[PDB]
RNA sequence: UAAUGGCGAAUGAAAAAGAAAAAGACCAAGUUGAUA
RNA sequence: UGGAAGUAUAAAUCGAAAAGGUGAUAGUAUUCAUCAAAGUCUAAAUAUUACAGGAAAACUGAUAGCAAAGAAGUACUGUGAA
RNA sequence: GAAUAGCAGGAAAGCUAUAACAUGAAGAGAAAACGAAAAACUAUGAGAGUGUAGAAAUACAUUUAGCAAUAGUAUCUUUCAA
RNA sequence: GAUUCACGCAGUGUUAACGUGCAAAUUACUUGUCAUAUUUGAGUAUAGGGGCGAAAGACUCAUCGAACUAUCUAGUAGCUGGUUCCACCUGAAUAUUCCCUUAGGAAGGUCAAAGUAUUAAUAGUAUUGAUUGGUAAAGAUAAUGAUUAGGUGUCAACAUCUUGUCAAACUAUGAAUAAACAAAGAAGAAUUCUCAGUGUUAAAUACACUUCAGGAAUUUAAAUAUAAACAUACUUUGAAUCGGCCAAGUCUGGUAAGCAGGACUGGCGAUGCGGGAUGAACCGAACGUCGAGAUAAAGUGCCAAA
RNA sequence: AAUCCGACUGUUUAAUAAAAACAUAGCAUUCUGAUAAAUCUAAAAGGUUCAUUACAGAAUGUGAUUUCUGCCCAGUGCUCUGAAUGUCAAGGUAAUGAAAUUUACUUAAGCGCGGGUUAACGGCGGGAGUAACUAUGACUCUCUUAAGGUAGCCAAAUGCCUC
RNA sequence: GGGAACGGGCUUGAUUGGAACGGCGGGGAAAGAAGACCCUGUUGAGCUUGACUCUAAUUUAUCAUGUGAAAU
RNA sequence: GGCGGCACAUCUGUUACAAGAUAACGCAGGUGUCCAAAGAUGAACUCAAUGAGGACAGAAACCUCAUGUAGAAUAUAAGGGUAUAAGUUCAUUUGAUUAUUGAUUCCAGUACAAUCAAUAACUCUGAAAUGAUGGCCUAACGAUCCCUAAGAUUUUUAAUUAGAAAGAAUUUAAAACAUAUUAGAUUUAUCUGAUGUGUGAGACCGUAAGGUGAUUUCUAGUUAAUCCUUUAAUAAUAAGGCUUGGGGUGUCAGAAAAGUUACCACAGGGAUAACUGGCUUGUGGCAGCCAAGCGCUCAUAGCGACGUUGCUUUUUGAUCCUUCGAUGUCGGCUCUUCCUAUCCAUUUCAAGCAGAAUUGAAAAAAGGUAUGAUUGUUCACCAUUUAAUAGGGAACGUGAGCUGGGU
RNA sequence: AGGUAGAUUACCUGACGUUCCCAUCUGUGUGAACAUAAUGGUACUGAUCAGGCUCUAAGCAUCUUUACUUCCGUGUUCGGAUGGGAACGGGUGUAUCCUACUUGAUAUGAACCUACC
RNA sequence: GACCUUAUAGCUCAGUGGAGAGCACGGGAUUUAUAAUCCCGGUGUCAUCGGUUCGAUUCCGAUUAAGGUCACCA
RNA sequence: UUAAUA
RNA sequence: GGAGUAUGGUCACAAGGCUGAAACUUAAAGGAAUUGACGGAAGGGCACACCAGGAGUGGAGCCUGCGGCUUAAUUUGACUC
RNA sequence: AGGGAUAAAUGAUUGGAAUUAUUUGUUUUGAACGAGGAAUUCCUUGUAAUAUCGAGUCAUUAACUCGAGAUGAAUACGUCC
């Protein structure tokens, strides 16, 4: 919901409690060279139409929130998942 | 079996290794031109 | 296609060489290994339920075995394929 | 009775071939890389004797061995993890 | 592209005949129509997701909301029908989980057949002992609610004392029936001596675990009832089944139902026999082939034994 | 003697429907100047209308005559003699990198923007009050649509209530 | 009467002489046909539509090098 | 069946039967969230309400005392829990973290999810014991493949210096050409033969005990690489692996999916509707019991309210037991029979029966109960006639008996 | 006899009055510092002038309450069992289990370690 | 019956987590007088009950009225 | 610009 | 007036044209012209009529007249200039 | 301290009679009223405007009317809106 940046959480790499920078995880750009994409492009080539199912029955309205808690001094990034919230905001 | 496949249902070879039999020869291009 | 960032074929476009191809994860480089495409022929080992001639059988024995053990693809049906 | 190669007999039968391989003897890992003893321990358990007595068979006392099975221990190989 | 009759033709009516017919669409009378958008022969053209159609999905060889014929093809079917000798032994199911599941599957329960173990491996039972629960009942200025009145004190109103009647989604109290233990298995007890490794600890000789670590002696078969050696514990492989139905000193929805759905048990299904005249379930009692007797439910005027 | 439908002559479900159904003449709309329009074919100096040429060819609705065809371009179609820098492909160009790759810029139709069109598909409102007894409401009020069902006609083969 | 709740057969009664001709239309829940109505199949087919995925025809752009020039 | 609804994933109370399990399209409701504080900890305080007082101030503003078992509050539905608190206020804080195990709840003793018990780190709060791995408890959620992020540096190697300890190493037939040096040819991005050494080489010196010596080991600094793979060897890009999260399937153990057939077809079904029959009798029809009253007086000549008890299957419901390899589905026509809850004729009793006409009731079902306009009608409404023109059953009597008007 | 720490958590609570304090405990004086709040009221710290006035503790009462016994009552209900009675509804008989509410009598605490008196 | 929507001045509608518009009505002005015109004012239980509510006319259920759609195969 | 009635 | 209406006849595709009454109702309807009045008709003049301004009234309190209300009576005349 | 209504306790006048205060003094009471909306009135020089005096009515009672003087603006010399 609301969560401030600048957390102080144990960092496994340094084995110590260090300040940590909290952000939100966004899915990266889908690549055209991963194996699953190359296989899908090959299948769609040629006659036969859509060769793979297309999801069309969405029911969920929200998504689980993943924070990217990052070591300030050592760049070790953790990932903490939060429960589904309709409105999420990064506080002060 | 490796692999392929709404990686689902299914599809799917080959070198090695062991036998049968065993066999190699030509054009083109190049050279010789009192040229055939 | 088992061949997965393309194994094989074909089409449209493009198109080499003081050579080059392959080493199946795309790319560049340096080594290594192995071949030398884009013309041709070639016996033997292999297949066979056309058909012909034979020999066998833990096969059938006239509603069985070929549809057909007699003038059987005959009698008979259909415009015709059948 | 892997193909296949020989034998007598004439044989879809029979006999013989130090042999490629299949499954197994070693297991874990995606893979690289690896690859098993404290010559084991504990518990209960199969069997074998001696003595006494009832007195027909059999019923007790005591000595000994402790396999299979189950359970639990150390130890060792592999795995991020047994 | 006027009105009618005739040769012909069609098919309006009888919804006549016939309806295993003369006929796989015909006959009789009636009606209509009977030359120019007329009738008709031969030749010719148009062919299957095609043709042709003054349009009915009509016609395309008795076949048309997609012909006929052959191959794929013995197409697939969770659906329907059938599935072949005798005797003997054992003998079921409708719970639970998941499925595009609901006329069907897989895990699992019930069952059968094979194969084992001397076996810390018996119990749909009762008793004694310590418990658990919140049902039946009970209560109603005992908590939360519901509701009829009567006194006393400061019209009502508010306090306070009684009375009458109630709660599946109220409760102090709380049965009967039940549930889960114990009644002597590191292997049938106890005591004495000696006693080690860790750790707890302030330190321990306390304490905890270690085959009640271990080792040795003496004593000992005891510790509710009943039943149980063709007992007990199973292991492996697998069949069928999960449409159910009835009864009731039971319950829920419904006016009610031979209605619909549940808790516990017993049955029918899978089951014949004696009785209720007859009947899937009721009562007695379950079955190798027979003889003799005593019986059960129930009966003894005749059918009908008494 | 009347009522309904179809104007008429004609055709129709071979074998249960012969009719109000189909055709019809008449009316109306759309496209096309032939190297075209419609349209058959896998392809084709291929084929049909077409031995034709807008008084023609092709595609549709209504169905003689008389009288008349009202309002609506918002929605979906169709169209434009129309706009540019909204969105839009393969490509083309350029840059970095050793290279694949990656990134940026630029590209047509189409959609979007604007207009036209209903004899294109189609559509064409609600409440309340008030006229010297009682009704009815010529009349105002105000919510609202792209337009509010116009001329006509009616318990109609079209009206539940309804005999 | 009971039963699958409408028996020719079973139970209790009523009652019966063997073979039948012409009619007849009550019954044999008479014959004809694996219900055409309804439902269930993860069985179809015709037809419709911005149902999903495609496709012929139509359309637009690029490539496929005829010569000689000018503007951007 | 369709329309409606979700009893499809899911929580609370009750049905529900004092262990566990547990039905209905049974009842009353609930979820797809919300929270940097509403998580953690420490301290202080006590709530709702009532009484009595205080200028404006009153029923309700703010202050004070007293009583006050929670009648307040605790994010939410309901039920549980809570008073030096789990409620209010104040203060610090991020344990709402990383790694590894063992169990309990659904359970097939599978997965997901949830509920706990410990261990190893680093931390928060407190003086401390303790407490802290999200919310006081019961719901608030999700596979394979695919996409997308985080992590694998604690360690192991090679090379090179210093020191130290063991260490023969296998044994004759040879080509690639890195080249030098010559014999020819050539001008181009120049080639073609042969001679040559090394490369590339490996039989250690011992009849003297054995030393030397490649190659390997340990320790101390140095520089380099360091999760695995792309299979001839490396490199920097790329791609694939391993562990853990997110993106989702609500039909919630998870296909990618619009209608209509009256032109319809097939495999089946009484597991399942439209007709009879069967149970029921709400509804319909008929009949009773009591007696507040009406009936000028008079509860009962004739009725009979408020209540209450029955019968019938002639209406429609309710169910789905029989029939889906078929029981021909409305009405009318013709014809027979049966019931009485009797319309007429016969015999009686009663009256608010003077006569006539009537009304209530008993015996009695042997006999009669009609003709037409409209409608397919059953039904109905009209016009007559009659002594009366009553109500019903028989597969809603009766289609190899008719008709085919309706459906 | 009193104080500290408790265990059982009303026989321990609530209301009305009552008795000592000799030690102990409490109330009691004060604000300089630690510390504290709006307020030395609380909490904090320093102290000893006075008092049993309230605490606290012990006792009183036809005391509400609470805790055991009897009775209520073998009355409610219930496990088992008919070809037992009734048109139902419901309720016997048999071999058994057996509440609750009220009411009456009784009680109002017992007990553990340490110090002092 | 089943789903959906609405309910606010005397009449038609607006808008609502702390009630506008119009028409109507009343008073004053202009006019010989009415109508029109100008000026000012008074008008809403937000349909009736419960809960969330800081606080409801708004948010959540209920009871009413008012309409709209469906009520099919036999 | 608008200007109805008795 | 009814009325160029109804009906009948005829002409026209139609609208309509030609011919064309009666019942009933009613003391007036109408023509030219005169005088006045009026005109959001024209022309010529005038007025604090307006213009340029002043003071104001209308808004407050009170005095006073009128309407209304009240009362036994609130006596009455006058209602644009 | 502008404003002097409204109320109070008291002193006298005229009158036959003063309460519903005839008129008036004293002290206290201290209200609207911050230049006034739509509209509308009068005025051209000793005029408007401002404040006062006399007279009519008059036993008592002027904020009324009819007159008189005191100070002395602004604005036009126009036009038919």
mmCIF file with all atom_site columns, N, CA and C (backbone and C1' of nucleotides) in Angstrom, chain H residues 228-243:
data_model
loop_
_atom_site.group_PDB
_atom_site.id
_atom_site.type_symbol
_atom_site.label_atom_id
_atom_site.label_alt_id
_atom_site.label_comp_id
_atom_site.label_asym_id
_atom_site.label_entity_id
_atom_site.label_seq_id
_atom_site.pdbx_PDB_ins_code
_atom_site.Cartn_x
_atom_site.Cartn_y
_atom_site.Cartn_z
_atom_site.occupancy
_atom_site.B_iso_or_equiv
_atom_site.pdbx_formal_charge
_atom_site.auth_seq_id
_atom_site.auth_comp_id
_atom_site.auth_asym_id
_atom_site.auth_atom_id
_atom_site.pdbx_PDB_model_num
ATOM 1   P P     . C H 1 228 ? 31.981 -22.856 -12.949 1.00 0.00 ? 228 C H P     1
ATOM 2   O "O5'" . C H 1 228 ? 30.863 -23.836 -13.517 1.00 0.00 ? 228 C H "O5'" 1
ATOM 3   C "C5'" . C H 1 228 ? 31.013 -25.245 -13.434 1.00 0.00 ? 228 C H "C5'" 1
ATOM 4   C "C4'" . C H 1 228 ? 29.919 -25.968 -14.182 1.00 0.00 ? 228 C H "C4'" 1
ATOM 5   C "C3'" . C H 1 228 ? 29.971 -25.889 -15.699 1.00 0.00 ? 228 C H "C3'" 1
ATOM 6   O "O3'" . C H 1 228 ? 30.875 -26.813 -16.275 1.00 0.00 ? 228 C H "O3'" 1
ATOM 7   C "C1'" . C H 1 228 ? 27.780 -25.431 -14.971 1.00 0.00 ? 228 C H "C1'" 1
ATOM 8   P P     . U H 1 229 ? 31.514 -26.527 -17.719 1.00 0.00 ? 229 U H P     1
ATOM 9   O "O5'" . U H 1 229 ? 30.271 -26.550 -18.715 1.00 0.00 ? 229 U H "O5'" 1
ATOM 10  C "C5'" . U H 1 229 ? 29.674 -27.773 -19.118 1.00 0.00 ? 229 U H "C5'" 1
ATOM 11  C "C4'" . U H 1 229 ? 28.651 -27.557 -20.205 1.00 0.00 ? 229 U H "C4'" 1
ATOM 12  C "C3'" . U H 1 229 ? 29.163 -26.924 -21.489 1.00 0.00 ? 229 U H "C3'" 1
ATOM 13  O "O3'" . U H 1 229 ? 29.752 -27.873 -22.359 1.00 0.00 ? 229 U H "O3'" 1
ATOM 14  C "C1'" . U H 1 229 ? 27.144 -25.874 -20.817 1.00 0.00 ? 229 U H "C1'" 1
ATOM 15  P P     . U H 1 230 ? 30.766 -27.405 -23.512 1.00 0.00 ? 230 U H P     1
ATOM 16  O "O5'" . U H 1 230 ? 29.836 -26.707 -24.598 1.00 0.00 ? 230 U H "O5'" 1
ATOM 17  C "C5'" . U H 1 230 ? 29.016 -27.478 -25.462 1.00 0.00 ? 230 U H "C5'" 1
ATOM 18  C "C4'" . U H 1 230 ? 28.211 -26.605 -26.392 1.00 0.00 ? 230 U H "C4'" 1
ATOM 19  C "C3'" . U H 1 230 ? 28.999 -25.708 -27.330 1.00 0.00 ? 230 U H "C3'" 1
ATOM 20  O "O3'" . U H 1 230 ? 29.456 -26.389 -28.483 1.00 0.00 ? 230 U H "O3'" 1
ATOM 21  C "C1'" . U H 1 230 ? 27.242 -24.475 -26.337 1.00 0.00 ? 230 U H "C1'" 1
ATOM 22  P P     . U H 1 231 ? 31.008 -26.744 -28.660 1.00 0.00 ? 231 U H P     1
ATOM 23  O "O5'" . U H 1 231 ? 31.152 -28.151 -27.931 1.00 0.00 ? 231 U H "O5'" 1
ATOM 24  C "C5'" . U H 1 231 ? 32.408 -28.798 -27.823 1.00 0.00 ? 231 U H "C5'" 1
ATOM 25  C "C4'" . U H 1 231 ? 32.242 -30.291 -27.711 1.00 0.00 ? 231 U H "C4'" 1
ATOM 26  C "C3'" . U H 1 231 ? 31.972 -31.025 -29.013 1.00 0.00 ? 231 U H "C3'" 1
ATOM 27  O "O3'" . U H 1 231 ? 33.162 -31.309 -29.716 1.00 0.00 ? 231 U H "O3'" 1
ATOM 28  C "C1'" . U H 1 231 ? 30.446 -31.753 -27.364 1.00 0.00 ? 231 U H "C1'" 1
ATOM 29  P P     . A H 1 232 ? 33.309 -30.941 -31.268 1.00 0.00 ? 232 A H P     1
ATOM 30  O "O5'" . A H 1 232 ? 34.877 -31.019 -31.495 1.00 0.00 ? 232 A H "O5'" 1
ATOM 31  C "C5'" . A H 1 232 ? 35.664 -31.906 -30.717 1.00 0.00 ? 232 A H "C5'" 1
ATOM 32  C "C4'" . A H 1 232 ? 37.067 -31.391 -30.529 1.00 0.00 ? 232 A H "C4'" 1
ATOM 33  C "C3'" . A H 1 232 ? 37.229 -30.137 -29.690 1.00 0.00 ? 232 A H "C3'" 1
ATOM 34  O "O3'" . A H 1 232 ? 37.162 -30.369 -28.297 1.00 0.00 ? 232 A H "O3'" 1
ATOM 35  C "C1'" . A H 1 232 ? 38.515 -29.929 -31.640 1.00 0.00 ? 232 A H "C1'" 1
ATOM 36  P P     . A H 1 233 ? 36.797 -29.160 -27.307 1.00 0.00 ? 233 A H P     1
ATOM 37  O "O5'" . A H 1 233 ? 38.018 -28.151 -27.454 1.00 0.00 ? 233 A H "O5'" 1
ATOM 38  C "C5'" . A H 1 233 ? 39.285 -28.446 -26.889 1.00 0.00 ? 233 A H "C5'" 1
ATOM 39  C "C4'" . A H 1 233 ? 40.098 -27.194 -26.698 1.00 0.00 ? 233 A H "C4'" 1
ATOM 40  C "C3'" . A H 1 233 ? 39.344 -26.009 -26.123 1.00 0.00 ? 233 A H "C3'" 1
ATOM 41  O "O3'" . A H 1 233 ? 39.253 -26.076 -24.713 1.00 0.00 ? 233 A H "O3'" 1
ATOM 42  C "C1'" . A H 1 233 ? 40.651 -25.313 -27.975 1.00 0.00 ? 233 A H "C1'" 1
ATOM 43  P P     . U H 1 234 ? 38.342 -25.031 -23.910 1.00 0.00 ? 234 U H P     1
ATOM 44  O "O5'" . U H 1 234 ? 39.200 -23.694 -23.920 1.00 0.00 ? 234 U H "O5'" 1
ATOM 45  C "C5'" . U H 1 234 ? 38.603 -22.469 -23.543 1.00 0.00 ? 234 U H "C5'" 1
ATOM 46  C "C4'" . U H 1 234 ? 39.394 -21.277 -24.011 1.00 0.00 ? 234 U H "C4'" 1
ATOM 47  C "C3'" . U H 1 234 ? 38.591 -20.000 -24.147 1.00 0.00 ? 234 U H "C3'" 1
ATOM 48  O "O3'" . U H 1 234 ? 38.380 -19.357 -22.908 1.00 0.00 ? 234 U H "O3'" 1
ATOM 49  C "C1'" . U H 1 234 ? 39.915 -20.293 -26.071 1.00 0.00 ? 234 U H "C1'" 1
ATOM 50  P P     . A H 1 235 ? 36.893 -18.960 -22.470 1.00 0.00 ? 235 A H P     1
ATOM 51  O "O5'" . A H 1 235 ? 36.832 -17.401 -22.773 1.00 0.00 ? 235 A H "O5'" 1
ATOM 52  C "C5'" . A H 1 235 ? 37.952 -16.579 -22.491 1.00 0.00 ? 235 A H "C5'" 1
ATOM 53  C "C4'" . A H 1 235 ? 38.141 -15.516 -23.539 1.00 0.00 ? 235 A H "C4'" 1
ATOM 54  C "C3'" . A H 1 235 ? 36.918 -14.682 -23.868 1.00 0.00 ? 235 A H "C3'" 1
ATOM 55  O "O3'" . A H 1 235 ? 36.680 -13.667 -22.913 1.00 0.00 ? 235 A H "O3'" 1
ATOM 56  C "C1'" . A H 1 235 ? 37.973 -15.351 -25.869 1.00 0.00 ? 235 A H "C1'" 1
ATOM 57  P P     . A H 1 236 ? 35.353 -13.702 -22.010 1.00 0.00 ? 236 A H P     1
ATOM 58  O "O5'" . A H 1 236 ? 35.146 -12.178 -21.596 1.00 0.00 ? 236 A H "O5'" 1
ATOM 59  C "C5'" . A H 1 236 ? 35.616 -11.130 -22.438 1.00 0.00 ? 236 A H "C5'" 1
ATOM 60  C "C4'" . A H 1 236 ? 34.478 -10.303 -22.977 1.00 0.00 ? 236 A H "C4'" 1
ATOM 61  C "C3'" . A H 1 236 ? 33.143 -11.040 -23.054 1.00 0.00 ? 236 A H "C3'" 1
ATOM 62  O "O3'" . A H 1 236 ? 32.061 -10.147 -22.792 1.00 0.00 ? 236 A H "O3'" 1
ATOM 63  C "C1'" . A H 1 236 ? 33.777 -10.328 -25.212 1.00 0.00 ? 236 A H "C1'" 1
ATOM 64  P P     . U H 1 237 ? 30.640 -10.734 -22.321 1.00 0.00 ? 237 U H P     1
ATOM 65  O "O5'" . U H 1 237 ? 29.716 -10.588 -23.609 1.00 0.00 ? 237 U H "O5'" 1
ATOM 66  C "C5'" . U H 1 237 ? 29.186 -9.326  -23.978 1.00 0.00 ? 237 U H "C5'" 1
ATOM 67  C "C4'" . U H 1 237 ? 28.414 -9.395  -25.270 1.00 0.00 ? 237 U H "C4'" 1
ATOM 68  C "C3'" . U H 1 237 ? 27.107 -10.168 -25.243 1.00 0.00 ? 237 U H "C3'" 1
ATOM 69  O "O3'" . U H 1 237 ? 26.034 -9.448  -24.668 1.00 0.00 ? 237 U H "O3'" 1
ATOM 70  C "C1'" . U H 1 237 ? 28.329 -10.767 -27.164 1.00 0.00 ? 237 U H "C1'" 1
ATOM 71  P P     . A H 1 238 ? 24.889 -10.229 -23.861 1.00 0.00 ? 238 A H P     1
ATOM 72  O "O5'" . A H 1 238 ? 24.378 -11.340 -24.879 1.00 0.00 ? 238 A H "O5'" 1
ATOM 73  C "C5'" . A H 1 238 ? 23.486 -11.014 -25.932 1.00 0.00 ? 238 A H "C5'" 1
ATOM 74  C "C4'" . A H 1 238 ? 23.180 -12.218 -26.784 1.00 0.00 ? 238 A H "C4'" 1
ATOM 75  C "C3'" . A H 1 238 ? 22.441 -13.349 -26.091 1.00 0.00 ? 238 A H "C3'" 1
ATOM 76  O "O3'" . A H 1 238 ? 21.046 -13.130 -26.004 1.00 0.00 ? 238 A H "O3'" 1
ATOM 77  C "C1'" . A H 1 238 ? 24.276 -14.236 -27.255 1.00 0.00 ? 238 A H "C1'" 1
ATOM 78  P P     . A H 1 239 ? 20.246 -13.574 -24.687 1.00 0.00 ? 239 A H P     1
ATOM 79  O "O5'" . A H 1 239 ? 20.082 -15.146 -24.852 1.00 0.00 ? 239 A H "O5'" 1
ATOM 80  C "C5'" . A H 1 239 ? 19.517 -15.696 -26.031 1.00 0.00 ? 239 A H "C5'" 1
ATOM 81  C "C4'" . A H 1 239 ? 19.824 -17.167 -26.161 1.00 0.00 ? 239 A H "C4'" 1
ATOM 82  C "C3'" . A H 1 239 ? 19.510 -18.028 -24.951 1.00 0.00 ? 239 A H "C3'" 1
ATOM 83  O "O3'" . A H 1 239 ? 18.139 -18.341 -24.812 1.00 0.00 ? 239 A H "O3'" 1
ATOM 84  C "C1'" . A H 1 239 ? 21.652 -18.565 -25.726 1.00 0.00 ? 239 A H "C1'" 1
ATOM 85  P P     . G H 1 240 ? 17.532 -18.571 -23.345 1.00 0.00 ? 240 G H P     1
ATOM 86  O "O5'" . G H 1 240 ? 18.049 -20.019 -22.950 1.00 0.00 ? 240 G H "O5'" 1
ATOM 87  C "C5'" . G H 1 240 ? 17.804 -21.126 -23.800 1.00 0.00 ? 240 G H "C5'" 1
ATOM 88  C "C4'" . G H 1 240 ? 18.554 -22.349 -23.342 1.00 0.00 ? 240 G H "C4'" 1
ATOM 89  C "C3'" . G H 1 240 ? 18.323 -22.767 -21.905 1.00 0.00 ? 240 G H "C3'" 1
ATOM 90  O "O3'" . G H 1 240 ? 17.105 -23.455 -21.710 1.00 0.00 ? 240 G H "O3'" 1
ATOM 91  C "C1'" . G H 1 240 ? 20.627 -22.824 -22.368 1.00 0.00 ? 240 G H "C1'" 1
ATOM 92  P P     . G H 1 241 ? 16.533 -23.640 -20.225 1.00 0.00 ? 241 G H P     1
ATOM 93  O "O5'" . G H 1 241 ? 17.424 -24.813 -19.623 1.00 0.00 ? 241 G H "O5'" 1
ATOM 94  C "C5'" . G H 1 241 ? 17.458 -25.046 -18.227 1.00 0.00 ? 241 G H "C5'" 1
ATOM 95  C "C4'" . G H 1 241 ? 18.747 -25.695 -17.793 1.00 0.00 ? 241 G H "C4'" 1
ATOM 96  C "C3'" . G H 1 241 ? 18.950 -25.769 -16.293 1.00 0.00 ? 241 G H "C3'" 1
ATOM 97  O "O3'" . G H 1 241 ? 18.262 -26.860 -15.713 1.00 0.00 ? 241 G H "O3'" 1
ATOM 98  C "C1'" . G H 1 241 ? 20.923 -24.967 -17.316 1.00 0.00 ? 241 G H "C1'" 1
ATOM 99  P P     . C H 1 242 ? 16.906 -26.608 -14.896 1.00 0.00 ? 242 C H P     1
ATOM 100 O "O5'" . C H 1 242 ? 17.336 -26.870 -13.391 1.00 0.00 ? 242 C H "O5'" 1
ATOM 101 C "C5'" . C H 1 242 ? 18.570 -27.505 -13.095 1.00 0.00 ? 242 C H "C5'" 1
ATOM 102 C "C4'" . C H 1 242 ? 19.179 -26.948 -11.837 1.00 0.00 ? 242 C H "C4'" 1
ATOM 103 C "C3'" . C H 1 242 ? 18.229 -26.197 -10.926 1.00 0.00 ? 242 C H "C3'" 1
ATOM 104 O "O3'" . C H 1 242 ? 17.452 -27.057 -10.118 1.00 0.00 ? 242 C H "O3'" 1
ATOM 105 C "C1'" . C H 1 242 ? 20.230 -24.966 -11.181 1.00 0.00 ? 242 C H "C1'" 1
ATOM 106 P P     . U H 1 243 ? 15.936 -26.674 -9.769  1.00 0.00 ? 243 U H P     1
ATOM 107 O "O5'" . U H 1 243 ? 16.077 -25.613 -8.594  1.00 0.00 ? 243 U H "O5'" 1
ATOM 108 C "C5'" . U H 1 243 ? 16.678 -25.971 -7.362  1.00 0.00 ? 243 U H "C5'" 1
ATOM 109 C "C4'" . U H 1 243 ? 16.828 -24.773 -6.464  1.00 0.00 ? 243 U H "C4'" 1
ATOM 110 C "C3'" . U H 1 243 ? 15.581 -23.926 -6.290  1.00 0.00 ? 243 U H "C3'" 1
ATOM 111 O "O3'" . U H 1 243 ? 14.685 -24.446 -5.326  1.00 0.00 ? 243 U H "O3'" 1
ATOM 112 C "C1'" . U H 1 243 ? 17.410 -22.527 -6.782  1.00 0.00 ? 243 U H "C1'" 1
#
